[PDB]
Short mmCIF file of C-alpha atoms and ligand atoms in Angstrom, two decimals:
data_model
loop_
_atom_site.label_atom_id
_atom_site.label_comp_id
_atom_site.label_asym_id
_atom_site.label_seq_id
_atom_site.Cartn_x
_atom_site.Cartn_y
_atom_site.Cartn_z
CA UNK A 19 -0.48 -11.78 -15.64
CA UNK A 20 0.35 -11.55 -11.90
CA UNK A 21 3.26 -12.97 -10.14
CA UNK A 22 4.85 -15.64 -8.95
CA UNK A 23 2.08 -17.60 -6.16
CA UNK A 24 -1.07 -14.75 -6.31
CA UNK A 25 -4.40 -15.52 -7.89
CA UNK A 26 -5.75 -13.79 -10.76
CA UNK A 27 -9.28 -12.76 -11.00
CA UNK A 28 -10.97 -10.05 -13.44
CA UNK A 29 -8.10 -7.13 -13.92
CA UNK A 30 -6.87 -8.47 -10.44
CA UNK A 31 -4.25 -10.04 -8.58
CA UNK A 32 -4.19 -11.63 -4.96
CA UNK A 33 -2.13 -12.85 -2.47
CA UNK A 34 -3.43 -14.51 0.55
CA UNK A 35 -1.52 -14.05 3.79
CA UNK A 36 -0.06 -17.28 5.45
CA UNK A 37 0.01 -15.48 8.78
CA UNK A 38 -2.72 -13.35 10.81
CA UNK A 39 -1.85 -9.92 11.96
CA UNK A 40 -3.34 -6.37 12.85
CA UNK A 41 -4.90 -4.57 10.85
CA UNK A 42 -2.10 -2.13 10.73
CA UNK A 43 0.38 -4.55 10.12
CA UNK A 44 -1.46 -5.47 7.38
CA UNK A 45 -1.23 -2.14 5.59
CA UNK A 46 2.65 -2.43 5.89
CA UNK A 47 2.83 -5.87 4.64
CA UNK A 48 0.46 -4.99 1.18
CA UNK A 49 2.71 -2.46 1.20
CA UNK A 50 6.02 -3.67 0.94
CA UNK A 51 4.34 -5.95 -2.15
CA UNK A 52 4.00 -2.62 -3.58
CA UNK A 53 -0.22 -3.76 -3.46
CA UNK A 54 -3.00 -2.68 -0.70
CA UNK A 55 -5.26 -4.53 1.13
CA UNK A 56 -8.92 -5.31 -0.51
CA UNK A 57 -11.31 -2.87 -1.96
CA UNK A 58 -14.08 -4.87 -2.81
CA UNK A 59 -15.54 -4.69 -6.40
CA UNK A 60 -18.94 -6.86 -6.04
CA UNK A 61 -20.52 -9.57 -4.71
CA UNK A 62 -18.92 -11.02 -7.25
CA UNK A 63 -15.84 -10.82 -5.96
CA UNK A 64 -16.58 -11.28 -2.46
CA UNK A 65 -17.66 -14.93 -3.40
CA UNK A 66 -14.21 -15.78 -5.37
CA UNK A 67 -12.12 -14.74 -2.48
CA UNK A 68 -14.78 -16.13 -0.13
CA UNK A 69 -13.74 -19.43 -1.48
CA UNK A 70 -9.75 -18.71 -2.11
CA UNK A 71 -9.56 -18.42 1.85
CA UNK A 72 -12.43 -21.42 2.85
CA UNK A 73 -9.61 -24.02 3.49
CA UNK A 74 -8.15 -21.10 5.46
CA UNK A 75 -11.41 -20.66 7.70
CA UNK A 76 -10.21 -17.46 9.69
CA UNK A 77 -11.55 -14.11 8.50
CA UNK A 78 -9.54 -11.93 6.45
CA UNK A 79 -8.66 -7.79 6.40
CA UNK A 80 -10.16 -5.78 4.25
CA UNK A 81 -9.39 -1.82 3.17
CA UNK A 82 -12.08 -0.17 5.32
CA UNK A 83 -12.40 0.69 8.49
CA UNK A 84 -13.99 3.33 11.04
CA UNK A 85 -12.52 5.99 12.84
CA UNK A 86 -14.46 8.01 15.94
CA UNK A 87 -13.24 11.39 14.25
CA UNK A 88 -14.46 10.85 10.99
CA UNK A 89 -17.94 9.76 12.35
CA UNK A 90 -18.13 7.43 9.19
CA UNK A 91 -17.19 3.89 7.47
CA UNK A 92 -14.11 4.66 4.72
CA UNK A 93 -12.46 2.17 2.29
CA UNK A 94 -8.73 3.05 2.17
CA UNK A 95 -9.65 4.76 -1.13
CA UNK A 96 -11.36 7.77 0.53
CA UNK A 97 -15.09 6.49 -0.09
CA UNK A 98 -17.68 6.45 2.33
CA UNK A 99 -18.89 2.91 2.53
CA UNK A 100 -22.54 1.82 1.02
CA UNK A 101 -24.42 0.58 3.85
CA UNK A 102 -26.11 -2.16 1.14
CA UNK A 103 -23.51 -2.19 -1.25
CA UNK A 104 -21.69 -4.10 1.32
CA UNK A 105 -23.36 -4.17 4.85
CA UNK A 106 -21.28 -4.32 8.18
CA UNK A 107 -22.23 -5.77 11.39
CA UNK A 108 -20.90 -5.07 14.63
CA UNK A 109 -20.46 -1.85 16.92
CA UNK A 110 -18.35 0.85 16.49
CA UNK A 111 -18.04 3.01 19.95
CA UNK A 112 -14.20 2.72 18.98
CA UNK A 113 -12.16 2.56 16.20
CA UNK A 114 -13.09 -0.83 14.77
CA UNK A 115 -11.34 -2.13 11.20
CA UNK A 116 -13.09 -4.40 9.08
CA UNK A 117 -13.18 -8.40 8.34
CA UNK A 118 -14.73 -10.52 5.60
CA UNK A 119 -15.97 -14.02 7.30
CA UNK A 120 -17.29 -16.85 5.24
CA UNK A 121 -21.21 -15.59 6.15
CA UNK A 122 -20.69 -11.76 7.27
CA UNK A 123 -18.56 -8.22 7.27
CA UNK A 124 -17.45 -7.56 10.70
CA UNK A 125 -16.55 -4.43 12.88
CA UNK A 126 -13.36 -5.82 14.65
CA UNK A 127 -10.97 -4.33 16.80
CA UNK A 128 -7.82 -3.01 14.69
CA UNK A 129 -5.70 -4.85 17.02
CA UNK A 130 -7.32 -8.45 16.40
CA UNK A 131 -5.15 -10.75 14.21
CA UNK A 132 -6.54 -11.97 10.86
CA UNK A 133 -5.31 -13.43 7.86
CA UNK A 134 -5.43 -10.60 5.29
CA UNK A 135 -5.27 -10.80 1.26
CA UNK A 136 -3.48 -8.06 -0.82
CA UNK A 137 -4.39 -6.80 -4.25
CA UNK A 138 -2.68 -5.51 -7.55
CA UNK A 139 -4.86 -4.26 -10.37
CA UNK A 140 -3.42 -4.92 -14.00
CA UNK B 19 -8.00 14.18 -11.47
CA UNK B 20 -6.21 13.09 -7.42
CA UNK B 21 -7.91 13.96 -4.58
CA UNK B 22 -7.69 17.00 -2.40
CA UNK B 23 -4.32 17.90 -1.28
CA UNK B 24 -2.55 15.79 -3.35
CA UNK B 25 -0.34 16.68 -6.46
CA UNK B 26 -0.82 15.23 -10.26
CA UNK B 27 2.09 14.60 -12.38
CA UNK B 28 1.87 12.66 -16.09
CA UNK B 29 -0.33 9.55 -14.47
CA UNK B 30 0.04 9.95 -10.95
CA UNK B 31 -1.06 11.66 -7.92
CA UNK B 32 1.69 12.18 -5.03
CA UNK B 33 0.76 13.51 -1.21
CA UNK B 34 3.86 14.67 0.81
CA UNK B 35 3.58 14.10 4.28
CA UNK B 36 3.92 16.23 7.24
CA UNK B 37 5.60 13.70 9.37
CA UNK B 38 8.67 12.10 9.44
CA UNK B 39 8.32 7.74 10.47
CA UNK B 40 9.97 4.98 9.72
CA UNK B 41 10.37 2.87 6.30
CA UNK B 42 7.84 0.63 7.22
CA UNK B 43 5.52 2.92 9.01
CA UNK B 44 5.25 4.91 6.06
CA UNK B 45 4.64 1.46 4.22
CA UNK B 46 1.42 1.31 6.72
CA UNK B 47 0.57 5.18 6.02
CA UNK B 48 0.36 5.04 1.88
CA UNK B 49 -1.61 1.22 2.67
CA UNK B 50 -3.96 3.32 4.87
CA UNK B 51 -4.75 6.01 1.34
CA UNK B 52 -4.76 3.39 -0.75
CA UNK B 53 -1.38 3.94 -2.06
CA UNK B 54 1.91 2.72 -2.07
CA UNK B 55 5.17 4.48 -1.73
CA UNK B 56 7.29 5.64 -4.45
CA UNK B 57 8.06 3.63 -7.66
CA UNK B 58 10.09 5.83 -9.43
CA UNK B 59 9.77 5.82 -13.12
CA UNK B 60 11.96 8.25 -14.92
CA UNK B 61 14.95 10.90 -13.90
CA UNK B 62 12.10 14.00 -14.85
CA UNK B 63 9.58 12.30 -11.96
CA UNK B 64 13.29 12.27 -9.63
CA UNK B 65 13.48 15.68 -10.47
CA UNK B 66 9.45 16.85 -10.03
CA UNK B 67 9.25 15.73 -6.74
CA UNK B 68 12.52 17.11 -5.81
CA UNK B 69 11.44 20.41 -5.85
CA UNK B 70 7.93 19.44 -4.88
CA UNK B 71 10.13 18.67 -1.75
CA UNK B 72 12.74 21.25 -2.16
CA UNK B 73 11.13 23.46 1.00
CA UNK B 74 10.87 20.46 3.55
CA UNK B 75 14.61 19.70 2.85
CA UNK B 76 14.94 16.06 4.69
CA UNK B 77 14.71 13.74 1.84
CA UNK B 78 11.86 11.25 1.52
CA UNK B 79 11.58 7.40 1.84
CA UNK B 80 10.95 5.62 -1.86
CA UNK B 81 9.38 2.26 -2.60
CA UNK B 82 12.70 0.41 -2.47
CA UNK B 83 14.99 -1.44 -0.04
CA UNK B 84 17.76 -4.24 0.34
CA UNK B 85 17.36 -7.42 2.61
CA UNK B 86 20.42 -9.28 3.99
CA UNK B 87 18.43 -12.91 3.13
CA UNK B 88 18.21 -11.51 -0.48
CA UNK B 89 21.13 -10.37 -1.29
CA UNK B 90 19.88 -7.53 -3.46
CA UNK B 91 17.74 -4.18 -3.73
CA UNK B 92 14.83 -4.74 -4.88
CA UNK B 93 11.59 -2.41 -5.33
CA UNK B 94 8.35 -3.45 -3.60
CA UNK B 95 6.93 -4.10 -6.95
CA UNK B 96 9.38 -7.55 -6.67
CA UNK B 97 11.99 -5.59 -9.56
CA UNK B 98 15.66 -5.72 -8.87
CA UNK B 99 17.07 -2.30 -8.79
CA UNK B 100 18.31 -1.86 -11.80
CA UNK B 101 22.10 0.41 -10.55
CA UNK B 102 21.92 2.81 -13.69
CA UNK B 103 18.67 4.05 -14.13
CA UNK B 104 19.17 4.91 -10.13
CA UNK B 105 22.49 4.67 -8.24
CA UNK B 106 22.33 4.03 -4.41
CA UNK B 107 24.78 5.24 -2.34
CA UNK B 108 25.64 3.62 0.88
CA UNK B 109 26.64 0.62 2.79
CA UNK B 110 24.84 -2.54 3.13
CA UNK B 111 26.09 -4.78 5.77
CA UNK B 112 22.49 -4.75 6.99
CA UNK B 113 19.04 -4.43 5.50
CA UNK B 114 18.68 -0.85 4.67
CA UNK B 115 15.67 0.86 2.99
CA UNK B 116 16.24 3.66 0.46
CA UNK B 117 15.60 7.67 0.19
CA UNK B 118 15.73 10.08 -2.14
CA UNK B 119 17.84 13.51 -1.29
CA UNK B 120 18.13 16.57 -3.03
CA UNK B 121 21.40 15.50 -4.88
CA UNK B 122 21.50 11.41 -3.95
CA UNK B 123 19.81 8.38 -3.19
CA UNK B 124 20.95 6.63 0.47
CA UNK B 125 21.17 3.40 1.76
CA UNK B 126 19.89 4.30 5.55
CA UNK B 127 18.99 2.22 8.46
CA UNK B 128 15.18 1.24 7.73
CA UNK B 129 15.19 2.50 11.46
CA UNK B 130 15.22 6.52 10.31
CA UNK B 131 12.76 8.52 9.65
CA UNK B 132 11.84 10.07 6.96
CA UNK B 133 9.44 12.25 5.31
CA UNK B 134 8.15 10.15 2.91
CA UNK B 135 5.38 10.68 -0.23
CA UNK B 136 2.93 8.16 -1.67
CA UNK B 137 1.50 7.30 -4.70
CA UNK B 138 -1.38 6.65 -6.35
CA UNK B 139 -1.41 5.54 -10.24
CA UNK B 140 -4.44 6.73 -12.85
C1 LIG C 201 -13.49 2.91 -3.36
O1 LIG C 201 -13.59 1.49 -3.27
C2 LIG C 201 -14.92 1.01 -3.24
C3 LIG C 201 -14.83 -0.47 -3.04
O2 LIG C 201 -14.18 -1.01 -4.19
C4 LIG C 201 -15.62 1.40 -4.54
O3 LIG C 201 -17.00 1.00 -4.45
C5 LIG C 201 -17.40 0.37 -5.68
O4 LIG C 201 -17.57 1.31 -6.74
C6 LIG C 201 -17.94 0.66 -7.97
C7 LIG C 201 -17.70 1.58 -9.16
O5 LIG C 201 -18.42 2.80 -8.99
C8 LIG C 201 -19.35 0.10 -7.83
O6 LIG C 201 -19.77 -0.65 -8.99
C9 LIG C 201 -20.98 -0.23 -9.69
O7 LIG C 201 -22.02 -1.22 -9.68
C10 LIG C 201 -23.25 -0.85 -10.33
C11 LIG C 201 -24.16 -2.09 -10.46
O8 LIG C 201 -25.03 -2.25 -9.33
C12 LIG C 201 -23.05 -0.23 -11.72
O9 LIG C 201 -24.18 0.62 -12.00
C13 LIG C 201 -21.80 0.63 -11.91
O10 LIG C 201 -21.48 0.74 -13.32
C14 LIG C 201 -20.60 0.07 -11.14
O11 LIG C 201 -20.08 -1.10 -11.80
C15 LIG C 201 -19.32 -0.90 -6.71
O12 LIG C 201 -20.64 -1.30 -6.37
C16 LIG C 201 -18.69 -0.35 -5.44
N1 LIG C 201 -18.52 -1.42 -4.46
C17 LIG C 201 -18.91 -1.32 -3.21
C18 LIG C 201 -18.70 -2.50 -2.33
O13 LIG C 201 -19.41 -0.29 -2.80
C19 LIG C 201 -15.51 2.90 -4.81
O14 LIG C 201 -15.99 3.22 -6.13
C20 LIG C 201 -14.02 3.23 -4.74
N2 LIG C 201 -13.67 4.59 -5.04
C21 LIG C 201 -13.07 5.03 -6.12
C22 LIG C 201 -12.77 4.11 -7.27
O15 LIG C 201 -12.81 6.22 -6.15
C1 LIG C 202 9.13 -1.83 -10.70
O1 LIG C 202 9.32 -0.44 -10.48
C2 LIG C 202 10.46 0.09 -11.12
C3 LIG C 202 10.56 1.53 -10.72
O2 LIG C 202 9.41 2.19 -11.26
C4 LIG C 202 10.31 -0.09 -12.64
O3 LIG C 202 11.52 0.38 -13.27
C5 LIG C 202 11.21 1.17 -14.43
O4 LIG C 202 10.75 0.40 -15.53
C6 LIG C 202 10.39 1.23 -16.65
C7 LIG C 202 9.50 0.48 -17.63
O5 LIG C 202 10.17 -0.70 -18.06
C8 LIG C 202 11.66 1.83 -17.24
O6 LIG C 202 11.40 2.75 -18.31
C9 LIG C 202 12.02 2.48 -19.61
O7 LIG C 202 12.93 3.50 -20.04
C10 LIG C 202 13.58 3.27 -21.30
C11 LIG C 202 14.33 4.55 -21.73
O8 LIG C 202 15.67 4.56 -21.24
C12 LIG C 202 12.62 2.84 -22.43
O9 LIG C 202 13.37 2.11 -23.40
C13 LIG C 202 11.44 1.97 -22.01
O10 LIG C 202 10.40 2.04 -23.01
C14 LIG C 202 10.89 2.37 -20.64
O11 LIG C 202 10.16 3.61 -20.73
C15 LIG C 202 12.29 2.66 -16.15
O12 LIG C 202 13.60 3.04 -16.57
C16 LIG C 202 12.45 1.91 -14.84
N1 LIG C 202 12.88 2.83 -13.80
C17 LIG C 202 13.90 2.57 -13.00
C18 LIG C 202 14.25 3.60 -11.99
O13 LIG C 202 14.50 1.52 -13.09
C19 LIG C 202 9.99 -1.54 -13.01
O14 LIG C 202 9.61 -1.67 -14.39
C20 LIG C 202 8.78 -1.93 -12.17
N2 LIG C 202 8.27 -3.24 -12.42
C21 LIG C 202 7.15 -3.55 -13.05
C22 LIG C 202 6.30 -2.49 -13.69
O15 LIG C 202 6.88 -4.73 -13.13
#
């Protein structure tokens, strides 16, 4: 099904952002579609949107991040992440909030701006 | 099933929070846990989360809010309010965001704060 200018794909729906923002800002934005940003699936997956957002280049959000206190990666689900389920590069002696690039997963700042996709699950 | 802390109720799990923010920072709080805020589906889940609010008082931010550009409430699910299965009370000569009260439901500046509870569909 889906609505009205988001992609469908498996028992989900997308909607790519046509502005960058923080990662914070992108919670509040999935939010007020009533979705959330990305918890990856597979590799699968990770190739459809992977091609979605080429024409946008960029780098988009994704639900996971890292936080000093917890000592550990988390989706926005509660789940540790699987280090080769999905494998993230970068360094995390702060806070960092994760991206999706055409070739990687990056540790970013949670104040850099990226394009960010939201999902719905029928 | 939930997770720890949070409350089940026919197919959904509901955490209260211990804060009070604003309508949109509590849109960025439920992104962060994977949730969204409130979609409220009958007058019994109104009433269930009433009293699972009854001791904070305060009355908590729901899913649903009015924008002047609009010109009409709408749920973040992209639903029009629909003004008798849930009354609002209040003015709108600005955008206003909605919460729930122990006897009402308010138009408010989106500017309060608000507890506010999120949700999380099985
Ligand atoms: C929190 O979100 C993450 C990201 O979506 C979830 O991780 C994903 O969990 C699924 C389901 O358990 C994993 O799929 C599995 O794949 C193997 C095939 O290799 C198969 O044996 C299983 O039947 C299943 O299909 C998936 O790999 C995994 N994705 C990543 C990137 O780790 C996690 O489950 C979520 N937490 C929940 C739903 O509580
Ligand atoms: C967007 O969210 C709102 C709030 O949850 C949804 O409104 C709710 O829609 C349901 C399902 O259509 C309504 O329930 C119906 O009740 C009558 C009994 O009077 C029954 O005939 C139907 O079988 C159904 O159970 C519910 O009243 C309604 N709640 C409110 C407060 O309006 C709306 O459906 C959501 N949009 C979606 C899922 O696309």
């Amino acid at each position: 099904k889906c609505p009205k200018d988001w992609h469908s794909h498996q028992d989900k729906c997308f909607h790519v952002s046509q502005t960058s923002i923080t990662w914070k800002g992108s919670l509040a934005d999935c939010g007020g579609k009533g979705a959330t940003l990305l918890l990856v699936q597979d590799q699968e997956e990770l190739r459809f949107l992977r091609n979605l957002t080429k024409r946008i280049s960029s780098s988009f959000w994704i639900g996971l991040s890292y936080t000093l206190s917890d000592e550990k990666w988390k989706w926005i689900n509660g789940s540790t992440l699987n280090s080769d389920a999905l494998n993230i590069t970068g360094d995390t002696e702060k806070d960092s909030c994760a991206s999706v690039s055409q070739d990687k997963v990056l540790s970013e700042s949670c104040d850099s701006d990226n394009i960010w996709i939201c999902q719905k699950e029928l």
